[PDB]
Design a protein around this ligand. Structure first.
Ligand SMILES: Cc1n[nH]c(C)c1CNC1CCCCC1
Length: 150
């Protein structure tokens, strides 16, 4: 009973979270997951400011109201070579990664590791935060409040 959560640097408080190395988060699970990090789904304005500070990924993830990919450098296999906050328009499917926004984070690039999941609740799952540099933090708990996500 284990969940891996791969996380990134924070840029103006915004970061990316991928669950179990696959697109596997529903919109309801995404909001609950950000709440476990004392965070919220970013607004489009919050995401645009993060992009301006150096944030980019090559993965679709929820923000408030849309599924997006922030892009700085054009790459043919990431958001069809677009730059800016690329918005997913047409998809059959509902599960993505998520972005999260922590208002208490530094204002610009914070590429220190994440060493806590401060607002997880009591539960039976071994949850492991995996940083890009491989460093890990694990704790037993739960974050999902909707049954259809478990
Ligand atoms: C700076 C830092 N490293 N690990 C932890 C925990 C913290 C405090 N802020 C984090 C920021 C991203 C969401 C979770 C909370």
């Amino acid at each position: 009973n284990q969940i891996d959560l791969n996380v990134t640097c924070r840029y103006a408080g915004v970061f990316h979270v991928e669950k179990n190395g696959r697109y596997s988060i529903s919109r309801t699970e995404a909001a609950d997951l950000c709440q476990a990090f004392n965070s919220t789904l970013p607004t489009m304005d919050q995401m645009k400011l993060a992009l301006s500070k150096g944030f980019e990924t090559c993965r679709y993830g929820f923000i408030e109201g849309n599924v997006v990919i922030p892009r700085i450098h054009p790459n043919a296999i990431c958001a069809a070579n677009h730059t800016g906050v690329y918005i997913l328009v047409t998809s059959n499917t509902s599960h993505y990664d998520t972005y999260c926004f922590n208002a208490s984070a530094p204002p610009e690039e914070d590429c220190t590791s994440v060493t806590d999941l401060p607002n997880s609740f009591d539960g039976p799952v071994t949850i492991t935060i995996v940083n890009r540099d491989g460093t890990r933090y694990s704790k037993k708990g739960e974050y999902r409040t909707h049954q259809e996500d478990i």
